Amino acid sequence: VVLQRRDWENPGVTQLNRLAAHPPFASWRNSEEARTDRPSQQLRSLNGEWRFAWFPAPEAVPESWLECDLPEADTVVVPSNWQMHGYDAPIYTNVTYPITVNPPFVPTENPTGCYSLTFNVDESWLQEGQTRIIFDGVNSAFHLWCNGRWVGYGQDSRLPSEFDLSAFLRAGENRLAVMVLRWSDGSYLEDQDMWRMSGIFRDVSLLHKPTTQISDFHVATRFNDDFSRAVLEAEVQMCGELRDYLRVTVSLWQGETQVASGTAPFGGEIIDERGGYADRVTLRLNVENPKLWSAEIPNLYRAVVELHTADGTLIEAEACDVGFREVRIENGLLLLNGKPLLIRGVNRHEHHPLHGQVMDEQTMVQDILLMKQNNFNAVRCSHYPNHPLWYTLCDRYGLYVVDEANIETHGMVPMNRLTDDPRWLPAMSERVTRMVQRDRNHPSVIIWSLGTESGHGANHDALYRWIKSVDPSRPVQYEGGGADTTATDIICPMYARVDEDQPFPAVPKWSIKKWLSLPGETRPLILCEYAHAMGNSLGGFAKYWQAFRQYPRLQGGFVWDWVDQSLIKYDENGNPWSAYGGDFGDTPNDRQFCMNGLVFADRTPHPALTEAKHQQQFFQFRLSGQTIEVTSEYLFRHSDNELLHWMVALDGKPLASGEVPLDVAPQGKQLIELPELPQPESAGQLWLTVRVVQPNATAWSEAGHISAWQQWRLAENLSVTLPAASHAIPHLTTSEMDFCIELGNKRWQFNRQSGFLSQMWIGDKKQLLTPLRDQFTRAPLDNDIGVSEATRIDPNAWVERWKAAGHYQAEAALLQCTADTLADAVLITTAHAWQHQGKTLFISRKTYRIDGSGQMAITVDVEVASDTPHPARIGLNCQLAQVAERVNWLGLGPQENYPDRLTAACFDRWDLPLSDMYTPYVFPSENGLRCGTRELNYGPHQWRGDFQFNISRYSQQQLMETSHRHLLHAEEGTWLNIDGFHMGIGGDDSWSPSVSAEFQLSAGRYHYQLVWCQK
Amino acid sequence: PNHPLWYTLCDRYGLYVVDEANIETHGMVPMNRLTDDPRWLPAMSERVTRMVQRDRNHPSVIIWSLGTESGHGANHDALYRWIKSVDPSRPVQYEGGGADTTATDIICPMYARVDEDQPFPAVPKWSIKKWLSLPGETRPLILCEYAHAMGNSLGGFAKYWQAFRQYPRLQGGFVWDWVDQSLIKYDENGNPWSAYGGDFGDTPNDRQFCM
Amino acid sequence: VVLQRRDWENPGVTQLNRLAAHPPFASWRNSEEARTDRPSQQLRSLNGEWRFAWFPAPEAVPESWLECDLPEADTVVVPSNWQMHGYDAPIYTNVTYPITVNPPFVPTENPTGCYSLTFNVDESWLQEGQTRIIFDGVNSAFHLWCNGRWVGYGQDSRLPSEFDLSAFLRAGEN
Ligand SMILES: O=C1O[C@H](CO)[C@H](O)[C@H](O)[C@H]1O
Ligand SMILES: [Mg+2]
Ligand SMILES: [Mg+2]
Ligand SMILES: [Mg+2]
Ligand code: NA
Ligand code: NA
């Protein structure tokens, strides 16, 4: 009947014989083991080596497989995605469905994973009680057999499917057969922008419960006005035979101390004309001065739920961690424990570069640590319920969680075609209701989400109300249909900009500041997605945080996103490389658009992470005279693990430093008076830097962890002393093709046909491999290219405007090249025009002054045609012959920083290996820029001025021609790009121009000056 | 939902209609055991949604009902909101769980009395005059059932109508009910007689309570 | 698979292959007929004399009934309640369910009404367009076959269940 019914092409069948959803169970038979959360003899893992065979369709599966192991099958580890063992290709598509849109049907060619396990069951498990199997995650649908007999069927890839195996099992050896389908009608609700994989990718377990059992329990905590008193309310349900001797005890523990306890027989209050629930009981425990849970101090208690007889014989115990906290929206503000939150959030998919969508504790812990170390306090489960351990870890480490139903129908036209259809209400309801039933006792979950990108349909309204009715403790949000529909308690837009309206028809994205005050609007605004961190991105991040801090009802947002969804492939030599869309033969695909993370797949930070850390700081600073004002943004905790280190330096040379303990109340202020600083012995700019340091290790950070910093310019003494007059006078030599200048062991050559410096000599060793030429282009960033889908060739994108205007094609045309001998110098004057098909794009006018001290002063004045698209940069580039080990600069750093992403960078003297001056974005682009640089040192060379630079073994040309970072090859010398000016990188989104007007190079006329010398 | 012709005739002759979903779980213990269970939401939703989809163009239909005697479950709230979203032109009413829950736009009690309170635990039937002015209450009151017309009955009918006329927000009600549910049986001579519960060998039965 | 699935003991299955619900249709091919609400040639009634047999359970239904009229069956008027034709007793109960309260299960002794009809369809309906069958009320659940082939299943006693018969119909007797 299984092949005949085709349950995987019927949205009215989402399960068969599946048990009811419930909070995490372990069926402890000892209360102390429940209290301490130790392992339970009644909960076994079936994880490990299973048997697996791949088939192109369920019709290709032999009947013998149900009762006997296939000899051709392989032994594979479970949990796994079968794409990660190479049985078929993972597919990366964003919006467009990986299957033809013909609901409820899927392709007849539907990859089928046949899993099986031969395993033991002890006789004691079968002599009494109930033995069930739990599949925490099967993608996307499956039938289950046990000992050759059909058990049931399940859909929804991201929540546990449980089945009663009591009547199916024998003492001794037993065999499970699991037929997993890659595609089902469930897939229509699973159109997340991620790799499309399949298999048994989450834990498999066996759970033994007694016949008379705890079948459900809900924990609620309510508070008085000042949170000095709480009532813990615990509703407990049983299954089995009802009896007068039955009792439930809920006890609450803080460490080894029992704080409160209540005991009652079964039988709820009368609720209607037919009485009440005889199979339910509600316990109420008073708790004076509860320790409150927050992401700042994750105070937890332990609730133990004992099912027992009147005289104390235990039947079973369940338990959970309890966090006493209230979440409510009042007067337009989201309040936690009566205080308005500021969400420093990030979206986090479950992704591993080797294991695919299988999650392990180590990876989860690594993520949480990195998130907290970088000043995140919140996470969004984009876009499905997570591995169950995730919530336990967020409970214990302290992160706010948006728990989100596994519903996305992005690729439908229009987006709400299914979600407005009552025929799809049952499938949708189970994704929402079974999530709430599983996760409702986790304190870390503060907000429910109805899913993502599924338009706004009547089904959303129905399910919104269901949650509000079933769990009044948490707000419900949902972004679809314009982010402010009747199905959301919070205005939760994606990539709405700070000041700029994007007034799309029907679903406009208003400036977030504007959105709050639209006539009749009163709700809080928290972006469910913002600051798209794809490649070289997070330009404009500081603008969001300034607005968040200024506007009470702007309460933050969740960055998109945490980790690049790249996957490891191996080349012919067996060396690993990072792969994206299309690299597995998957087609259609959306290329690099799966890589939007603040960290690489292996959790190495992108440069943008530090910009997020700095903007998300919990301490704010002001300077007035000798006084630093420190303001705490903590809502609950005092600064009891913080000291302020301060340092004053003169152009990188340390002058004075000290330490002061921080003693700041939540939302409080502390004034720190700096000692009288000694006056500088020379010219230059004094800089004050402050860092907040955590002396002690925490659960989430090491001793000496830096949590916050800030810099200010102090006194400046401009240099008024002229350089010591030189005896020597540089000599000019003139040929038809060159102007050469010589001074001691130094020589400069200017090509009279090109008009550029073609060579320089130290001794008589050549310094250049390529001439020093103007550059007005950059290897395009992902933000420059501006595509969310591989098929789109968008004329509006920056890269396309540059290409169409001929910026990449423009050839320098020489207008002037003259040489004059001065009293103590040689002056070379040049002028070039860059034209494309008769149009003058740019004019560059330069002077090079070479004096007797060996310094070459370059003055550059550029004209940019007002009607050409604003250029990516205004600078010079050359390939140096030198390959040196180190780069030393006085400027902003140490990490990569761009004009609209430089707030985290500090001004100082930095020294790094050359390789650190390149950022290995998996899709190569312009990278490694450092701004506000007054001095750069590389080998024998020094450049001085006020410029931005990048320095690497890769030319802009190679970077723009190369699609993968592992395909890059170090070129002969060192490519140097020195920019007078450089365009913003943007990032408000990555599929439309996102660079703010103040960071575009639109001034028309540009001036910069550089001194090049040998040190 | 009735035979489709009923709505056509009510349109043309002129009667106001409460169109009601085919959902009643009276015999459950407690009454909301199914209607508060998410497993039964799909079956319940089709009884509501497919009614609205059929009858939403009939002018005679002025109010939707979520069914009767099924307590008050979270499934009622979901479906209440579904209707309000899909068809804002008609109020939604539902009596279960005490006649004034979050799943009803109209206080719609059954057999609430004019002056006399019946303060049952959980689901009290207040005096209708008193019900209207309970703290915070602002909704209209229309009894979905009153004046049980069983046998020699309708004593005190005038008392309802005096109150309906005096109180603006007491906007009437629906008598229980129109027609006796008696069935024709025939005796030895082939003479017809009116039969009720039990007269077909049906057991358990509730006798004349169908009339 | 019909007897094996027991769709009538599963609240997750309320229908199979049932068409979307909609307001009353008549598919007029003349605008003046639509305006005046006169009969439509495209809306036929199948009310009248049908064949009927009673069984104590669906397991008792002979497989031959799918493709051939039962000789022991009676000719009855439809629409009708079969209790009113004396096939079994109507039950009057108020609150207490007529069956043991054990959701989603019903008694094994489940009175089964086997209705059948032989009918002709005019030629032009076979060549073009979509032909559906509408059951305005069936109490309480039913499976449907057309020319021996299974069509679908429906619940809810008080709303129409509609099924596309286009791929099932043939020239002559159906
Ligand atoms: O709006 C979105 O933009 C992201 C683009 O990377 C990603 O597709 C998210 O899943 C989606 O919610
Ligand atoms: Mg299905
Ligand atoms: Mg999407
Ligand atoms: Mg059913
Ligand atoms: Na704010
Ligand atoms: Na993406």
Ligand code: NA
């Ligand atoms: Na590139």
Ligand code: NA
């Ligand atoms: Na009145």
Ligand code: NA
């Ligand atoms: Na009655």
